[PDB]
């Protein structure tokens, strides 16, 4: 069959109400940040907008009825390469600063078994370094991992 019925939706629809305190039909940062608090998750202002943005299909800044449902539905398939981006980043992030430099990158290449020097790594960081800040940030790491 591969489909959802009122029985399956009836459950998901219940989840929305749980997050919707004022029950206005749309989840905002104020209503979301609150629930997350009781759960034990105090994300950053930029992080919160990011989470909602992901599910934000109509780009309204809030989680609609179907927006929250479709989110759990995506679990079926599609959307996976992204995980490899976040996981890998953490796997390479030794100092846990959230940034990759020629020093760290060079160390990662060693684990793979690739003989590279400081002069060589320069060519790498130069590629990922889009903003030309002198280092490779997550924003750049995600684009380099998503693109060829």
């Amino acid at each position: 069959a591969d489909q959802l019925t009122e029985e399956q939706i009836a459950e998901f629809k219940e989840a929305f109400s749980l997050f919707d305190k004022d029950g206005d039909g749309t989840i905002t940062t104020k209503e979301l940040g609150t629930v997350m608090r009781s759960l034990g998750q105090n994300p950053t202002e930029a992080e919160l907008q990011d989470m909602i943005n992901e599910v934000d299909a109509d780009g309204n800044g809030t989680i609609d009825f179907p927006e929250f449902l479709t989110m759990m539905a995506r679990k079926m398939k599609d959307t996976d390469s992204e995980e490899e981006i976040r996981e890998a980043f953490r796997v390479f992030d030794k100092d846990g600063n959230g940034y990759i430099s020629a020093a760290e990158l060079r160390h990662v290449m060693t684990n793979l078994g690739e003989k590279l020097t400081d002069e060589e790594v320069d060519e790498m960081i130069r590629e990922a370094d889009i903003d030309g800040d002198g280092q490779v940030n997550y924003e750049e790491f995600v684009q380099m991992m998503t693109a060829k």
């Binding site: 997350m36 995506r74 996976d80 060829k148």
Partner: protein
């Protein structure tokens, strides 16, 4: 195969394939504790 340009970066990207996870859906799991 032989040589050309810096094909090292592509080595870090690995092949296409992995697990699925949303940047919010996980929160739902935390709801298992909070009353309904």
């Amino acid at each position: 195969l032989s040589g050309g340009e810096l094909d090292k970066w592509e080595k870090i990207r690995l092949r296409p394939g992995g697990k699925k996870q949303y940047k919010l859906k996980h929160i739902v799991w935390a709801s298992r504790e909070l009353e309904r």
